[PDB]
Write an enzyme that holds these catalytic residues in place. Structure first.
Site, PDB file in Angstrom:
ATOM      1  N   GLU A   8     -12.169  24.293  -4.291  1.00 16.89           N
ATOM      2  CA  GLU A   8     -13.250  24.057  -3.832  1.00 16.89           C
ATOM      3  C   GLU A   8     -13.370  22.616  -2.850  1.00 16.89           C
ATOM      4  O   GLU A   8     -12.569  21.892  -2.966  1.00 16.89           O
ATOM      5  CB  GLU A   8     -14.425  23.324  -5.310  1.00 16.89           C
ATOM      6  CG  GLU A   8     -14.490  24.042  -6.312  1.00 16.89           C
ATOM      7  CD  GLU A   8     -15.088  23.546  -7.325  1.00 16.89           C
ATOM      8  OE1 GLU A   8     -15.267  23.992  -8.533  1.00 16.89           O
ATOM      9  OE2 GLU A   8     -15.985  22.523  -7.067  1.00 16.89           O
ATOM     10  N   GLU A  13     -12.660  21.136 -13.501  1.00 24.80           N
ATOM     11  CA  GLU A  13     -13.016  19.824 -13.065  1.00 24.80           C
ATOM     12  C   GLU A  13     -12.979  18.946 -14.628  1.00 24.80           C
ATOM     13  O   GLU A  13     -14.000  18.295 -14.755  1.00 24.80           O
ATOM     14  CB  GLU A  13     -14.309  19.181 -12.483  1.00 24.80           C
ATOM     15  CG  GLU A  13     -14.280  20.063 -10.922  1.00 24.80           C
ATOM     16  CD  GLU A  13     -15.444  19.812 -10.094  1.00 24.80           C
ATOM     17  OE1 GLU A  13     -15.285  19.498  -8.851  1.00 24.80           O
ATOM     18  OE2 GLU A  13     -16.504  19.698 -10.706  1.00 24.80           O
TER      19      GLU A  13
END
Ligand code: NA
Ligand code: NA
Ligand code: NI
Length: 476
Positions: free
Chosen positions: A374, A176
């Site tokens: 995710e 991320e």
């Protein structure tokens, strides 16, 4: 006759610091996660100066997967996973980050973990940096304020590629990496980048300089990894929160365009190998003048990624009123509630159709394979005294996201590599440091205060996902 491809990767995703525990075992150094205290919804975690005697650090013990991984992997096998996404703890391999030689005990732990996966039909998918850089790199070098930390990361990546080249096919560099676009709050700069801000500093400029060094580090790692094993698939990892215009008001449209540029320019560098012109113009206009060299640009050009890994949890919305001609975007202030969707108890908006939107957003721009690494619904779980966990709210969230992801493959022609739901065994949450915000198909008996037996039990969603995998996504 499944919509999804026959060799589709069905797994679950975790991060080392969020489940391993053993935070000072086997030679491991102190990581940035190890100096972050527990928090809660509406209560930010605190970042402390080293590990302090009178604080609760929930990542120190987590759920003790470091000791219990053999039993947990038997649960993973019963679930039917064919892959397992986790991180290699940087501090297990280079405890302080700047050692000449790696820690052999840490290299042996992942040898044993990866071997245990593969003997049970489960392929490891590895993220190299996942919010857990050595705290020594922060205090001594400044984290990714420092060009030296680029070489430290590449040294670490190269050790990992070499050791596990026969066991790990799919890799990702920086988890991320775009979270730090929200630099006004302390969490993302410290966990993405090892940035601890001093009073009076230009927080935005420091974030962009660290993001540049990380993109350079990633690109160097990609090229090195490819030289070690050209069958490696090395992806980026983008936190994909679509940002919708509130309305067809033309300033709402342009505000959404500008926010997306501010949040996702990272992807353009990862994929194309050079900076997009809108973020370059923004930096010039703000006189954010980064240390960028010609070798940097050559490294970026030669380290483009093979696929886009991304997380999806929610969508945002923005209004453009009064945002003028610049449409500057402050994520900590400028978001608005989307009246058309529900929201979780932690305030994360529920928008399964946004997952299809996200997939098209990537595909329209890049034409690369995607990997949903995710996706999850963080919610409170309750034990009935009979023992079961009736998490229908979690099945509902996940089943509608998988249905939208199938619609993207069936109608939009998306090339989707796999799906690994987040936190599929209850672990310590990142944003809040909580056990209470549960994601799992597997319940773990441990609460926010650290009490509990740490026993594992199957929730109702466990049998649901088992049959999702069994039917390659046809029975939701
Ligand atoms: Na409306
Ligand atoms: Na809130
Ligand atoms: Ni032990």
């Amino acid at each position: 006759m499944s919509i999804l491809k026959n060799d589709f990767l069905w797994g679950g995703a975790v991060a080392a610091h969020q489940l391993e525990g053993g935070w000072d075992q086997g030679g491991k150094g102190v990581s940035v996660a190890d100096v972050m205290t527990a928090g809660a919804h509406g209560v930010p975690r605190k970042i402390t100066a080293g590990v302090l005697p009178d604080e609760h650090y929930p990542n120190h013990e987590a759920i003790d997967f470091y000791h219990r991984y053999q039993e947990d992997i038997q649960l993973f096998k019963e679930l039917g996973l064919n892959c397992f996404r986790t991180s290699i703890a940087w501090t297990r391999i280079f405890p302080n980050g700047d050692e000449e030689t790696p820690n052999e005990e840490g290299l042996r732990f992942y040898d044993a973990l990866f071997d245990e996966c593969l003997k049970n039909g489960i392929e490891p998918v590895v993220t190299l940096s996942h919010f857990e850089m050595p705290y020594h790199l922060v205090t001594k070098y400044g984290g990714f304020r420092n060009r030296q930390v680029i070489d430290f990361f590449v040294k670490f990546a190269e050790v990992c590629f070499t050791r596990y080249q026969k066991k790990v096919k799919y890799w990702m560099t920086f988890n991320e990496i775009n979270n730090q676009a929200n630099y006004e709050e302390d969490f993302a700069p410290f966990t993405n980048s090892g940035i601890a801000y001093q009073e009076g500093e230009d927080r935005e400029a420091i974030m962009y300089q660290a993001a540049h060094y990380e993109l350079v580090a990633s690109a160097r790692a990609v090229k090195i990894g490819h030289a070690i094993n050209p069958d490696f698939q090395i992806g980026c990892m983008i936190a994909m929160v679509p940002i919708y215009p509130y309305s067809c008001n033309p300033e709402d449209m342009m505000m959404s365009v500008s926010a997306m540029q501010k949040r996702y320019w990272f992807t353009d560098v990862h994929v194309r190998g050079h900076y997009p012109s809108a973020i370059q113009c923004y930096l010039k206009r703000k006189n954010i003048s980064l240390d960028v060299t010609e070798e940097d640009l050559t490294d970026l050009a030669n380290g483009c990624v093979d696929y886009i890994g991304f997380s999806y949890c929610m969508s945002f919305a923005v209004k453009g009123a009064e945002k003028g001609p610049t449409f500057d975007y402050n994520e900590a202030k400028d978001l608005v509630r989307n009246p058309y969707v529900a929201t979780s108890d932690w305030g994360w908006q529920i928008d399964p159709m946004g997952l299809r939107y996200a997939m098209n957003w990537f595909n329209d721009r890049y034409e690369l394979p995607l990997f949903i690494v995710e996706n999850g619904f963080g919610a409170i779980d309750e034990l009935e005294p009979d023992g079961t966990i009736n998490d229908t709210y979690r099945i509902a969230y996940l089943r509608e996201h998988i249905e939208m992801m199938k619609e993207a493959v069936a109608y939009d022609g998306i090339d989707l590599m796999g799906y690994t739901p987040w936190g599929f065994i209850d672990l310590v949450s990142a944003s809040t440091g909580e056990m209470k915000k549960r994601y799992g198909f597997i319940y773990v008996d441990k609460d926010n205060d650290g009490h509990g037996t740490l026993e594992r039990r199957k929730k109702k969603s466990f049998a649901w996902y088992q049959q999702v995998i069994a039917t390659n996504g046809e029975e939701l």
